Design a protein around this ligand. Structure first.
Ligand SMILES: OC[C@H]1O[C@@H]2O[C@H]3[C@H](O)[C@@H](O)[C@@H](O[C@H]4[C@H](O)[C@@H](O)[C@@H](O[C@H]5[C@H](O)[C@@H](O)[C@@H](O[C@H]6[C@H](O)[C@@H](O)[C@@H](O[C@H]7[C@H](O)[C@@H](O)[C@@H](O[C@H]8[C@H](O)[C@@H](O)[C@@H](O[C@H]9[C@H](O)[C@@H](O)[C@@H](O[C@H]1[C@H](O)[C@H]2O)O[C@@H]9CO)O[C@@H]8CO)O[C@@H]7CO)O[C@@H]6CO)O[C@@H]5CO)O[C@@H]4CO)O[C@@H]3CO
Ligand SMILES: OC[C@H]1O[C@@H]2O[C@H]3[C@H](O)[C@@H](O)[C@@H](O[C@H]4[C@H](O)[C@@H](O)[C@@H](O[C@H]5[C@H](O)[C@@H](O)[C@@H](O[C@H]6[C@H](O)[C@@H](O)[C@@H](O[C@H]7[C@H](O)[C@@H](O)[C@@H](O[C@H]8[C@H](O)[C@@H](O)[C@@H](O[C@H]9[C@H](O)[C@@H](O)[C@@H](O[C@H]1[C@H](O)[C@H]2O)O[C@@H]9CO)O[C@@H]8CO)O[C@@H]7CO)O[C@@H]6CO)O[C@@H]5CO)O[C@@H]4CO)O[C@@H]3CO
Ligand SMILES: OC[C@H]1O[C@@H]2O[C@H]3[C@H](O)[C@@H](O)[C@@H](O[C@H]4[C@H](O)[C@@H](O)[C@@H](O[C@H]5[C@H](O)[C@@H](O)[C@@H](O[C@H]6[C@H](O)[C@@H](O)[C@@H](O[C@H]7[C@H](O)[C@@H](O)[C@@H](O[C@H]8[C@H](O)[C@@H](O)[C@@H](O[C@H]9[C@H](O)[C@@H](O)[C@@H](O[C@H]1[C@H](O)[C@H]2O)O[C@@H]9CO)O[C@@H]8CO)O[C@@H]7CO)O[C@@H]6CO)O[C@@H]5CO)O[C@@H]4CO)O[C@@H]3CO
Ligand SMILES: OC[C@H]1O[C@H](O[C@H]2[C@H](O)[C@@H](O)[C@@H](O)O[C@@H]2CO)[C@H](O)[C@@H](O)[C@@H]1O
Ligand SMILES: [Ca+2]
Ligand SMILES: [Ca+2]
Ligand SMILES: [Ca+2]
Length: 686
């Protein structure tokens, strides 16, 4: 199938995700509704179950609501069994309607449906060219009272019905007992409880092996993607090991939730997206959008800065899942705000780089404050809304115009309130004009584009007061007036002659695993694939078509390789960098070094004889390591993904900037577990 096929689990850049709060979408089966104090059929008490389930999703998939909108993928609440308790938080009853309080990762949440129901949902979706993404929160189980065991379900973790352990009397140390996080530091938010939620200990072999086995069941069930909950609250090294487990089995597009506040630009976050094996929800993008289009706290120069910066900071900016709101923030549409603000933010998002995600009901102009007022039941299934039509008109462009799915992004015209940007990929172009100023039109002169000479009709058909464009020679557009609150889209599509790679997934795996290379101009006859200088052709190239190529990763040494391809004629494509070839199956190992004294600003890192540890290159060292929670300075610790069963030599370094101090003596050595976890403890050698 082609790159845009529903069968493409490794690429969502040509799709448009619709995030569904399962309980608040559609109750397709009243028979599975919880009862009594745990239920409110009228969905007035937004903290109880409202009855929304998987059958309801199936129904809306079958009645054209989602298809008619151009939605090609859905992101649903965590499907696993949650606790059944009703939690009283200061006179307020609560339930796990949101699916974030897991109790058994190998079972379904009855409220949502059964295993069969889930299977039916997968089949119904795939039958309508709709991919299924599931939320997965392996950070914790549920709320628990380390003091009072009778509280809730004591954060009890079950394994397909078999109790593994609870928060109280945690002799096995399935959980963390480091108190609660104040979000003061990254390490603080990782090894301490998220609120009162029982923090799972991924360095516990039973926990590590359990979770990995769990996701495998869901993969076997047919999921096309994973949305990892609170990734900034789990060990990065462990998550890499988790992603390797997924990629080395059945790779599916995975993105994590790493919240970013207004104006927050974090290198840690960039590094995670660039090296974890998963992408992220674009909070940087979402927060700037809200400033620019919703709150009026930044102008188009901020949007432009975000677009340029993000393209340079994220190795795979096209893998970042964009959005304008979600279940953890005020609904984008303010009760008395001008609807055009939402329509414009949506139009911008749908035509921008990455993977667009639309919070359910956005298209019905739902308003609401923070939890749980942002999770009201969808008020209508109308297709006549302006927002609904904007999506219906733009969403499909991600499939028919590779410029929008894989194209670069360039600012072509700009001022305080106006942004005109261009997307380009092969013989495809798209230009988007946006005037956020709802009371003042703008005069556009001097606009230059990559569009071929001619007249271009607004794809939105003037729905958002757009207009026709006139392109002359050199691609210079004739003067035009951009209406107040105007938004227009102009495009050009044609067959691409030369091989051009627009996407690669997954971006991290061990040799032998099959990767998907998408783009255009590959030709119909098998060509060549390059991993760095290594050439791959013939049998290992499972399939080759103009837009998609499936090839097995060659048995090259672990490392970072640049991906390139050549058509049958020998014509080379562009280079898609940052591909990580694993040294093999991975395991999460905790490295601990004692007595590593440093000065303020100086940190300790880990370097080793394998690519997973940077092959002795300080620039590629692992860290900086932690020294507050699990161990205290001068003791340092860190959880790293390493090649399972390999004898590895390592050493520690002290670094300030790029200046590096090597641990003295000889190399430390150890053999990585064949499965599960392990902890290596050593003293820093002078
Ligand atoms: O059971 C807990 C909830 O679980 C479910 O939520 C999940 C999220 O849906 C999921 O997407 C993900 O999101 C979390 C993310 O992983 C974290 O990194 C972090 O993300 C950022 C956060 O979103 C930002 O808003 C911000 O937080 C700051 C906050 O904005 C700021 O105001 C302040 O917060 C303090 C409040 O101001 C103060 O009033 C008090 O809050 C109380 C709260 O009022 C009270 O009602 C009670 O909260 C209950 C809640 O009412 C319940 O509904 C239930 O929520 C569950 C959700 O419904 C699920 O969807 O349980 C809650 C907790 O028991 O208690 C609160 C605190 O005791 O204190 C606030 C904290 O000081 O400061 C914060 C921090 O700066 O920054 C974050 C990044 O640093 O949080 C995301 C949302 O939790 O994971 C969730 C967990 O599965
Ligand atoms: O949340 C706290 C801060 O978080 C963020 O900081 C991160 C850093 O930016 C990042 O680089 C990294 O830091 C690591 C650092 O790089 C490593 O070197 C290592 O540090 C260890 C150090 O090498 C060891 O020598 C030792 O430090 C000793 C230190 O040498 C010695 O002087 C003494 O320290 C005393 C202070 O000198 C003294 O002044 C006082 O400290 C006060 C502090 O002066 C005061 O301002 C106040 O600090 C605030 C701070 O101002 C706030 O901005 C906020 O800081 C956060 C950063 O902004 C974030 O970027 O909160 C702070 C807490 O109040 O209060 C301090 C105490 O009241 O007393 C000190 C003790 O006598 O002793 C120390 C200890 O032996 O140990 C170092 C680590 O223990 O590790 C660093 C972090 O682990 O990571 C940071 C967090 O992720
Ligand atoms: O492929 C090459 C090697 O790559 C890998 O090596 C990595 C290290 O394992 C790893 O630890 C890290 O190294 C850093 C080190 O940990 C830090 O401590 C520091 O090192 C500096 C050191 O602390 C300083 O004192 C100084 O070293 C001086 C040394 O003390 C001094 O005696 C003299 O060295 C001479 C030797 O004494 C002498 O015996 C002879 O060495 C022979 C060697 O005995 C013989 O076996 C053979 O060596 C092979 C080696 O066996 C192979 O395995 C292979 O090594 C690789 C490592 O295995 C990888 O892990 O190649 C070697 C060379 O072919 O042949 C040797 C030469 O005949 O000669 C020595 C020099 O003539 O002088 C030195 C310098 O004054 O400096 C050190 C560095 O400044 O920093 C290290 C990183 O720079 O990373 C390594 C990868 O870079
Ligand atoms: O003509 C090329 C020129 O186009 C854009 O410049 C605009 C500018 O953004 C407007 O604010 C206004 O000054 O009109 C200019 C066109 O004359 C691009 O921004 C700029 O990079 C480019 O050179
Ligand atoms: Ca139901
Ligand atoms: Ca945690
Ligand atoms: Ca790249």
């Amino acid at each position: 199938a082609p790159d845009t096929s529903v069968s493409n689990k490794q690429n969502f850049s040509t799709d448009v995700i619709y995030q569904i709060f399962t309980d608040r979408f559609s109750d397709g089966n009243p028979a599975n509704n919880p009862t009594g104090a745990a239920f409110d059929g009228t969905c007035t008490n937004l903290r109880l179950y409202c009855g929304g389930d998987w059958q309801g999703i199936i129904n809306k998939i079958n009645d054209g609501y989602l298809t008619g909108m151009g939605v090609t993928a859905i992101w649903i609440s965590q499907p696993v069994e949650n606790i059944y308790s009703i939690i009283n938080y200061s006179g307020v009853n609560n339930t796990a309607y949101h699916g974030y309080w897991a109790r058994d990762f190998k079972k379904t949440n009855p409220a949502y449906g059964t295993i069969a129901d889930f299977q039916n949902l997968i089949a119904a979706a795939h039958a309508k060219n709709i991919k299924v993404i599931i939320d997965f929160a392996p950070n914790h189980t549920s709320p628990a009272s380390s003091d009072q065991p009778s509280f809730a379900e004591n954060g009890r973790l079950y394994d397909n019905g078999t109790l593994l352990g609870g928060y109280t009397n945690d002799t096995q140390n399935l959980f963390h007992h480091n108190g609660g996080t104040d979000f003061s530091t990254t390490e603080n938010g990782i090894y301490k409880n998220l609120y009162d939620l029982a923090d799972l200990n991924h360095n516990n072999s039973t926990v590590d092996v359990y979770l990995k086995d769990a996701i495998k069941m869901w993969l076997d069930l047919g999921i096309d993607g994973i949305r990892m909950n609170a990734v900034k609250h789990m060990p990065f090294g462990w998550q890499k090991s988790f992603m390797a487990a997924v990629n080395n089995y059945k790779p599916v597009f995975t993105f994590g939730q790493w919240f970013l506040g207004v104006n927050e630009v974090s290198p840690e976050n960039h590094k995670f997206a660039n090296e974890s094996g998963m992408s992220l929800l674009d909070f940087r993008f979402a927060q700037k959008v809200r400033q620019v289009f919703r709150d009026n706290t930044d102008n188009m120069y901020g949007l432009k800065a975000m677009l340029e910066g993000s393209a340079a900071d994220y190795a795979q900016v096209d893998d970042q899942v964009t959005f304008i709101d979600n279940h953890d923030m005020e609904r984008f549409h303010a009760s008395n705000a001008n609807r055009r603000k939402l329509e414009q933010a949506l139009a911008f998002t749908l035509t921008s780089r990455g993977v667009p995600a639309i919070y359910y009901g956005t298209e019905q102009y739902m308003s609401g404050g923070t939890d749980p007022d942002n999770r009201a039941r969808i008020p209508s299934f109308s297709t006549s809304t302006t927002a609904y039509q904007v999506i219906q008109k733009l969403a499909p462009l991600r499939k028919c115009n590779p410029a929008i799915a894989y194209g670069s992004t360039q600012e072509r015209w700009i001022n305080n309130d106006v942004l005109i940007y261009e997307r380009k990929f092969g013989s495809n172009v798209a230009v988007v004009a946006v005037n956020r100023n709802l009371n003042a039109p703008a005069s556009i002169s001097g606009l230059v584009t990559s569009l071929p000479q001619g007249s271009y009709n607004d794809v939105l058909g003037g729905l958002l007061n757009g207009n026709t464009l006139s392109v002359g020679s050199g691609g210079a557009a004739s003067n035009f007036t951009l209406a107040a609150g105007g938004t227009a889209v102009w495009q050009y599509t044609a067959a691409t002659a030369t091989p051009t790679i627009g996407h690669v997934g997954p971006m991290m795996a061990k040799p032998g695993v099959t990767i998907t290379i998408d783009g255009r101009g590959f030709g119909s006859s098998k060509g060549t694939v390059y991993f760095g200088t290594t050439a791959v052709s013939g049998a290992d190239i499972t399939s080759w078509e103009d837009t998609q190529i499936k090839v097995k990763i060659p048995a090259v040494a672990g490392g970072n390789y640049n991906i390139k391809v050549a058509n049958a004629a020998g014509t080379a494509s562009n280079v898609y960098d940052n591909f990580e070839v694993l040294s093999g199956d991975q395991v999460s190992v905790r490295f601990v070094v004692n007595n590593a004294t440093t000065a303020l600003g100086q940190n300790v890192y880990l370097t080793g004889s394998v690519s997973e540890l940077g092959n002795w290159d300080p620039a590629k060292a692992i860290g900086p390591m932690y020294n507050q929670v699990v161990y205290q300075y001068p003791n340092w610790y860190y959880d790293v993904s390493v090649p399972a069963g390999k004898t590895i030599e390592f050493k520690f370094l002290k670094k300030q900037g790029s200046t590096v101090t090597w641990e003295g003596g000889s190399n430390h050595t150890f053999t990585a577990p064949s499965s599960g976890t392990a902890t290596i403890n050593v003293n820093w050698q002078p």
